[PDB]
Structures are given as structure tokens and as C-alpha cells.
């Protein structure tokens, strides 16, 4: 992945 | 100059309707709320089409929010300049997940003044994008048009595109 924020859902 | 592609086949029901096929190129003459006036490029037939059966087939590069070849930490400085504000946003090609896009929006908070928050636009099959799996969009134009009017889920509302 590599992830930013948390996906709003 | 304004061009859409048909997501679904539509078979007329009202007098004045234009019927059309999935994958058909239509051109917009009038944008009255829910039934737009179009001319098909396949037949030349004119008429009203149902608005949500089509998406923008118009280049993304002309759009104010779309910053083609930009990078995460620059998007944060781009936004942190004077001339921008909270609610200021931009969409940018993902440097990490190639093939993808991200959303950068300046935000306010009591404590660490002014953060710039990044989100991941996940890809759908064929016609689609999303940020929350609760709403899916056929294209980037339609995504942006929804969130500048509602924040639902997002930690701000997309007030203004980035001003360079």
C-alpha cells in the first residue's frame, strides 16, 4: 500500500 | 468544446428524449439541472439526456485543480504559500502508487495551526474513482463536483482550487 490519512470510509 | 461519454444505454421514455448507447459520444448544448440538451456524435440526433448517465470526456489538464506532475511535499508548499487558505485543494498524480491520484487539501486546527492533509483516490473498474467506498464516481470531474459542495467524510470542504 503506502497509506495517507485514513480513507474516510 | 464540451463533450461527454455515455455510461449506460438509454431508451427514450418522454417526448423530446434522445436515445443512446453505452460508450456513445454526446455533445452538450444546454445544462438545465437534471435533463441536459445533447447532440449525439454517432447519429446527429438531438435531445434531452439523463444527467447521471454521462461523464466528462474533456481533458483534465485544463482544470484548475489538476496539478499534473507534482509531488507530495511540494503540494504541501504549493498550498502553504500566501494566496491560498483552508479548503484549498489540488489533485496530483501519485508518485508512489503509479497509475493513481492523490488529493491535497490545506486544513486548520487549534494546536498545530495549518496542516496540509493527503488522501488516496482509489481506482475502480473501468468507469470509476473513489475516496470512500460509500460513493463512487465515473471520473475526476464528478468526484470534485460532489465534494466542493459536500464534505461527507473528508476533514474539510473542498473550498478553492490551488492558486499558483
From Swiss-Prot, chain B:
Domain SH2 positions: 65-162
Subcellular location: Cell membrane; Cytoplasm, Cytosol
Cross-linked residues, Glycyl lysine isopeptide (Lys-Gly) (interchain with G-Cter in ubiquitin): 37
Modified residues (Phosphoserine): 40, 100, 132
Post-translational modification: Dephosphorylated by PTPRC/CD45.
Residues recorded as bearing Phosphothreonine in the entry: 97
Limits of the SH3 domain: 1-59
Top-level taxon in the UniProt lineage: Eukaryota
Residue positions where Phosphotyrosine is found in the record: 130
Region (Interaction with PTPRH) location: 92-164
Tissue: Expressed specifically in lymphoid cells.
Family membership noted in the UniProt record: Belongs to the protein kinase superfamily. Tyr protein kinase family. SRC subfamily.
Domain comment as written in the entry: The SH2 domain mediates interaction with SQSTM1.
Subunit structure: Binds to the cytoplasmic domain of cell surface receptors, such as AXL, CD2, CD4, CD5, CD8, CD44, CD45 and CD122. Also binds to effector molecules, such as PI4K, VAV1, RASA1, FYB1 and to other protein kinases including CDK1, RAF1, ZAP70 and SYK. Binds to phosphatidylinositol 3'-kinase (PI3K) from T-lymphocytes through its SH3 domain and to the tyrosine phosphorylated form of KHDRBS1/p70 through its SH2 domain. This interaction inhibits its tyrosine-kinase activity. Interacts with SQSTM1. Interacts with phosphorylated LIME1. Interacts with CBLB and PTPRH. Interacts with RUNX3.
Function: Non-receptor tyrosine-protein kinase that plays an essential role in the selection and maturation of developing T-cells in the thymus and in the function of mature T-cells. Plays a key role in T-cell antigen receptor (TCR)-linked signal transduction pathways. Constitutively associated with the cytoplasmic portions of the CD4 and CD8 surface receptors.
Involvement in disease: A chromosomal aberration involving LCK is found in leukemias. Translocation t(1;7)(p34;q34) with TCRB.
Protein name as annotated: Tyrosine-protein kinase Lck
Shown segment, full-protein numbering: 63 to 226 of 509
